């Protein structure tokens, strides 16, 4: 468990590891926006 004073953040921490995956997906939203140029 996290130290008690950061306990407030458990549910955010459960999500942080996945964020680098989102950068890959963001690369495709960006390319969709400029028309796969």
């Amino acid at each position: 468990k996290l130290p008690e004073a950061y306990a407030i953040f458990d549910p955010l921490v459960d999500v942080l590891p996945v964020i680098p995956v989102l950068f890959l997906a963001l690369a495709f939203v960006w390319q969709a926006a400029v028309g796969f140029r």
Partner: peptide
């Protein structure tokens, strides 16, 4: 739940693209 944060975080990325293609930026 956890789905609240992953929603705020998940929208950050498309939000950036939207603001820039509306303010016609260097996309």
């Amino acid at each position: 739940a956890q789905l609240t944060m992953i929603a705020m975080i998940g929208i950050a990325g498309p939000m950036i693209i939207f603001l820039l293609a509306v303010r016609r930026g260097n996309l």
